[PDB]
Structure formats: C-alpha cells, structure tokens
Design a protein around this ligand. Structure first.
Ligand SMILES: Oc1ccc(-c2noc3cc(O)ccc23)c(O)c1
Ligand SMILES: Oc1ccc(-c2noc3cc(O)ccc23)c(O)c1
Lengths: 226, 226
C-alpha cells in the first residue's frame, strides 16, 4: 500500500457533510448547545465509519479502536470545522446552513473564547494554504496519535504509513527539499493548537452537560463521559 | 544565526535545576501539593530568564512576551520534567531529592491520572532516544508555538529558526532523508501530548486551588488565573 493509494483511500473514506439548519427562533444558550451537540452526535457516526475505512484500524484491538476514537473525536471534528471555515475569515462553518459569526458565540457562556481559538487556528491554516490532501492526512494522524497509552505495533506501523503519506503529498507540490521539512514542521506544530482547542471545548461541553443545560443523545453521551 | 549557533544560545539559556526535598513526614495530599506548587513557583523565575535568553524573544512586544509565557508555562515545566525523568522509568524526577513513583500519585485526588500521562509521554521520548540538543529545540518550540495569537512576523520567524535548528540537529545524525522526516514528525506529534498533559495539569491545579488544598499564592497564581 503506497502513500499514493493511502491518500486515495483517505479521500474515499472522507465523511460526507452533515446538514443542520438554524432553529426557528433567535439563538438562546439552549438552542445553540442543541444545534452543536445534535450536529456533533450525527458527525460521530460518520467518523466511526471513517476510522474503520482507514487501512489497519479495524485490525487493532477492539478496545484500542474505541480508545483512539473516544480520545480524538472533538479534535477530529474541530479540524473538519476548520477546513470548512478556511476560506471564510471571521466565520465558523459548522454546517453549510449553520455559519455562526464570531460574536454570535456570546449567546453561550464561555464558548466565545472557544470560537476565537478555532478562528485563529483556522486563520493559521489559511495562511499556510493548507491543501486538501494534507488535511486528509493530518486528520487521520490526529486519530492514530490521539491516545497516549501486537496491537501497539500495528498502530506504530499505521501512524508511520500516514506520516509517509503526508511527506509524499508535501513533496508532490514541487517545493524545495528544505521547504518540505519546514512545511511538515508547520502542519504538525498546529496539531498542538488543534489539541488545545479540543481540550477546552470538551471542558466547556462537559460543564454544559453538568449544568444540565443540554440533553444528551445516543452516541455523544458515551464519548463525553469516557 | 546559523543552526549550530542558535542551539548554543539555547544551551546557554538552560537555567539551573530548582532543588526541593521530600517533606518531613510521609506525603499528605496537602504537603504533596505544597511541594509541587513550591517547585513550580521557583522554576517560573528561572523560566523567565530562560525565555529572555532565547534569540528574539526580548525583541517581541512586552504583552506578546507575557502572552507566550502565560500560555505555555506548564508545558515547559512538564517537558523539563520529562527530560530529567527520561532515564528513570516509573519515576518522575521533579527534583534531585523529589523522585515520585507512579503509585505516589494516589496521595492526591486526580493527579494520578496526570502522572500516568507524564510518564507515558516521557516513556515516548525515551524510546525515540531523545538527544539533549533535540530536547533544547523542542522546549524552545513549545514557548514559541504556545499561544494561538510587525511583532507578528517576528514570531513565525523566531519559531522557524528553532525548527530549522532542530531540522539540522536531526540531519547531523546522518540518517536517511526518510528517517529524518519520520523523526521530526514523531517529535512534533508528541508536542500535542505535552500540550494535552499541560491542559489537564492546569485544570487539576485550578481545581485544587478551589479546594484550597494547595495554597497557590504569588507568581504561580498569575500563571494559573490567566
Ligand atoms: O461546547 C461545545 C460544543 C461543540 C463544539 C464544536 N467545535 O467544533 C465543532 C465541530 C463540529 O462539527 C461539531 C461541534 C463542534 C465546541 O467547541 C464546544
Ligand atoms: O496540581 C498540579 C501541580 C503540579 C503539577 C506539575 N506537573 O509537572 C510539573 C513539573 C514541575 O517542574 C513542577 C510542577 C509540575 C501538576 O501536574 C498538577
């Protein structure tokens, strides 16, 4: 399985876009939290289908597959969120029909700081001129590398193959050899930012759940608690 | 500055280790916290001199300097802890006479979870055989890549010089171009985990401050509230 086939497959596995519209009424802390959670919940199903299409994921132990998923879902969602919002400064494209403005975050306590984060990070990928093929590779890496802790070996092999796919895609651009290393370094240092946004969001979401301001759905309730 | 000279500036920037010792009686939740917040607080004074000795940091604006330090302080402390602990598996060398074992996390509510992370990441650096020069570059990249932001171009420039320095340090090993790209991605992917550990560590510390188990007072408090 060459780095070329792996990217091809990643493109195929791309999860389709989830559609969600704005509720019929001015956004209240309640309506917003519901819109985002329902959206996240629906997305989580597609992520799982995406993970399993990644060569070698299904071959990992059952408990590691869920360990990697429970650990990276917010990161993977916010990275998808960023790619969508890349060409639209100041906006967050949660869905084709759900494009919140920065200031619109002031409708939910504390989420405004999270919107700024996602916006700045997205702004950073924008300046980097993030390519679609790099995004696909970067997204798959967040998954395989999300968890700290015969199966560990396969994982190692899997992250290795994906890293090799990013390198290759980067090289395909025709830029300097010295630039290949700088760009690789730049894309990866942004993973800490994506990770930081994910940590903060989950904190926020968890507290919304405790403040019981939002009911939980089938699958998302299992991920948050983890 | 050429890579080699930048790395020497980084070496000269390395501050002394803060010495602390095991308290009088066995560890109480309160004394253990007093020990950790006491250690951090004294290390922060050293971390500030360290950052000021990094090429270009003092040329950044006053507010930027503080923004970077407030954003990454914990990440930097944990990374140094990892370096000091890299050769002693199962132990966290907070200081020469403060070597806690995994099972000593059970003295504080919720910090055992953090210890495990800290040891897993350290263990990760150990298997990659992290060389001192690499350690120096990564710690500096953490400070410069911390915040999610004329003085703006000064940073991406600063950061790029340290990355180039790391890129050089890896090349000096003489390994394959492919292995040079893999080692860089593996070292950089780990920054995410460090950031993650830093995030939990602070949530925990902020929580303790509320339970007032830890009397986080001066300097350190300025780093937490932010
Ligand atoms: O409290 C919350 C709830 C949802 C999010 C969120 N961020 O990015 C997203 C991308 C999605 O596709 C679906 C939900 C989110 C958040 O950052 C905080
Ligand atoms: O509540 C707390 C208090 C201190 C720490 C800590 N982690 O790593 C460290 C490294 C240091 O050099 C000094 C303090 C800490 C923590 O993770 C949670």
């Amino acid at each position: 399985l060459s780095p070329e086939q792996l990217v091809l497959t990643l493109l195929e596995a791309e999860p389709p876009h989830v559609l969600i519209s704005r509720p019929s009424a001015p956004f209240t802390e309640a309506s917003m939290m519901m819109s985002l959670t329902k959206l996240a919940d629906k997305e989580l199903v597609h992520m799982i289908s995406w993970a399993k299409k990644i060569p070698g994921f299904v071959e990992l132990s059952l408990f590691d597959q869920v360990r990697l998923l429970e650990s990276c879902w917010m990161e993977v969602l916010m990275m998808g969120l960023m790619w969508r919002s890349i060409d639209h400064p100041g906006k967050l494209i949660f869905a084709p029909d759900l494009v919140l403005d920065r200031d619109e975050g002031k409708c939910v306590e504390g989420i405004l700081e999270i919107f700024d984060m996602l916006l700045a990070t997205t702004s950073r990928f924008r300046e980097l001129k993030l390519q679609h093929k790099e995004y696909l590779c970067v997204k798959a890496m967040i998954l395989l590398n999300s968890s700290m802790y015969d199966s560990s070996r396969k994982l190692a092999h899997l992250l290795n193959a994906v890293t090799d796919a990013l390198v290759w895609v980067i090289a395909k651009s025709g830029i300097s050899s010295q630039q290949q290393s700088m760009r690789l370094a730049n894309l990866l240092m942004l993973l800490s930012h994506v990770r930081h946004a994910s940590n903060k969001g989950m904190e926020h979401l968890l507290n919304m759940k405790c403040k019981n301001v939002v009911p939980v759905y089938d699958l998302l309730l299992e991920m948050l608690n983890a």
